[PDB]
Amino acid sequence: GAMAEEQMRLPSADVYRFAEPDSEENIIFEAGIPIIKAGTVIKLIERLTYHMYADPNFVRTFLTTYRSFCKPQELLSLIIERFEIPEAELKRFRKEYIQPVQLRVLNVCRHWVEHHFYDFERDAYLLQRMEEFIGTVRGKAMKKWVESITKIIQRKKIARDITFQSSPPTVEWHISRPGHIETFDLLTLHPIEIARQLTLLESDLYRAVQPSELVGSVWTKEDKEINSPNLLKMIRHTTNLTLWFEKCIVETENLEERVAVVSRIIEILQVFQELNNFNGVLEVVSAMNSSPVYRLDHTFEQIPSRQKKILEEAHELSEDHYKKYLAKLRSINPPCVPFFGIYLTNILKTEEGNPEVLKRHGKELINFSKRRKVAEITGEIQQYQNQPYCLRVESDIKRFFENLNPMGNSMEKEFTDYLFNKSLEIEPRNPKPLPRFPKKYSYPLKSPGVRPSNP
């Protein structure tokens, strides 16, 4: 009948793999555009280039997350296989099936090269594969798609190899003067300017992270450096700044000097708060909560009450699954640098909390809802990625913070053991006595404060 007339108009299974019937054994949906829960890769590709309607949500999310279940080489071949459909009925079949599916495939190619060129930048063979495919396309409406895609391939070819709206404030200095990079340090640089330069650095690092770097826990795999470079730069910066804060504290063995170091780092946090760099606030909080620093009760004692409160209120941002942090983040306007660590925590819970596959009628379907959920979290990341700061770069201070290496030649575990042993040395556990230590700093320790220029 008329049901068979639709299917028999389409190609049979012996000549074409992307036209088998929709069923409980190959595809599952969660009225309008149906949201695909799970399915085999063949059925996911079919829906990615479906003839009845455009699915821009599915295209975006598929291309962001497909590497967790399908290689780029495998994907390119499957969309070419979808494209090469075997041929009044012929004229209607060309009208309603061949032309729209071929239009949808090229839209996927256009999206792929525009938004995920790094695949083609990684694999040289994948690019010349993609260009050869687009080269062999002859059609009426198909010509401007070929020009539009090859336009973008040229834009990314040249891309392979700052302006302010308002007047940015004066770069502030303290002990170290412009150019004297050998004297640059925590207490010698201006605290305001340390916060500004770290925020600019972290903002740039936040903005460079792409969605695919976070999918499938690929930053903790054998192939992490090419799959997740910007992500790894962000994580490593945080590691290096946090351990550097801890090192500055615990290697200051004189109590009164250590109090000054801690107080200065609290001031850096205060300026991060003014800038809405929440990444920076929680790096300071992490450093202050770490095993070596948190146990220094004698250092805590001499911190002014108002600074104590600032740290205590900053910690409380993290309590109850970051409730107050999330409310603070929604309440502010740009520019900001969101706390990056929460996205990794929630992505890991989603990855670990949902299975790779779903069984239905004794066959393993790919869990696409798992990928979309991860992609929804990366969507939140992206909405804070176009927020430039009205702040002037200082190249020497930037370079200093970009090249932090507190661990030196040590391993992380080894260095954090050293930090804790150093903590025990400077403030021994009770009932052992507290020894006095000599001063290490020859310059004045009084801070210049966090109020900028223009009295």
Contacts with ligand AWW by CB under 6 A: the residue count is 15
Tokens 């605290």 locate to: 191
Q: Is 385 in the site for ligand AWW (CB under 6 A)?
A: no
CB of 409 to ligand AWW, least distance (A): 27
For residue 410, give the amino acid letter: S
Check whether the bond before 428 is cis (ω within 30° of 0): no
CA distance linking residue 276 with residue 433, whole number of Å: 42
CB 190 within 8 A of CB 173: yes
Q: Rank residues 207 and 295 by Cβ distance to ligand AWW and give the closer one.
A: 295
**Site map 314..343 versus ligand AWW, x via CB under 6 A:** xxx---------------------------
Among 29, 125, 164, 294, binds ligand AWW (CB under 6 A): 294
Under the binding rule (CB under 6 A), the answer on residue 311 touching ligand AWW is yes
Give the DSSP per-residue string, 418-437.
Answer: HHHHHHHHHSPPTTS-----
Stretch that binds ligand AWW, among 126-134, 146-154, 282-290, 379-387 (CB under 6 A): 282-290
Q: Which stretch binds ligand AWW (CB under 6 A): 72-80, 103-111, 219-227, 288-296?
A: 288-296
Question: Given the rule CB under 6 A, which of 13-21, 95-103, 236-244, 281-289 is the region that contacts ligand AWW?
Answer: 281-289
Is 426 a residue that touches ligand AWW (CB under 6 A)? no
Among 197, 228, 270, 299, contact with ligand AWW (rule: CB under 6 A)? 299
Q: Does 48 bind ligand AWW (CB under 6 A)?
A: no
Q: According to the binding rule CB under 6 A, does residue 129 interact with ligand AWW?
A: no
Task: Identify which range of 107-115, 131-139, 287-295, 354-362 contacts ligand AWW by CB under 6 A.
Answer: 287-295
Minimum CB–partner distance for residue 174 and ligand AWW (Å): 22
Closer residue to ligand AWW in complex, CB, 188/307: 307
Contact region with ligand AWW (CB under 6 A), list: 40-48, 79-87, 219-227, 283-291: 283-291
Judge whether 45 and 366 are in contact, CB under 8 Å: no
Q: Which of 132, 225, 297, 425 contacts ligand AWW by CB under 6 A?
A: 297
As measured in angstroms, the least distance from the Cβ of 422 to ligand AWW is 14
Q: CA-CA-CA-CA torsion for 325, 331, 335, 337, nearest 10 degrees?
A: 10
Indicate the residue among 84 and 316 with the shorter CB distance to ligand AWW: 316
| Residue 436 region by backbone torsions, left for phi larger than 0, else alpha for psi between -120 and 50, else beta | beta
Nearest to 422 by CA among 239, 332, 291: 291
Look at the block and give the residue holding tokens 């916060």: 195
Q: Find the helix or strand (DSSP H, E) in which 69 lies.
A: none
Please report the DSSP string for 223-281 in residue order: S-TTTSHHHHHHHHHHHHHHHHHHHHHHT--SHHHHHHHHHHHHHHHHHHHHTTBHHHH
- Of the pair 130, 281, the CB lying nearest ligand AWW is at 281
Which of these, 210, 53, 74, 208, lies nearest to 129 by C-alpha position?
Answer: 74
Q: How far apart are CA 445 and CA 434, in angstroms?
A: 22
Helices (H) and strands (E) in the chain, counts: 21, 4
Query: Do you find a cis peptide bond into 448, omega within 30 degrees of 0?
Result: no
Token pair for 116:
């995920």
Which of 14, 89, 147, 312 touches ligand AWW by CB under 6 A?
312
Binding to ligand AWW by residue 293, rule CB under 6 A?
yes
Q: Which is nearer to ligand AWW, 22 or 297 (CB)?
A: 297
Tell me if 300 contacts ligand AWW by CB under 6 A. yes
CB of 5 or CB of 312, closer to ligand AWW:
312
Positions in the binding site for ligand AWW (CB under 6 A)? 262, 285, 288-289, 293-294, 296-297, 299-300, 311-312, 314-316
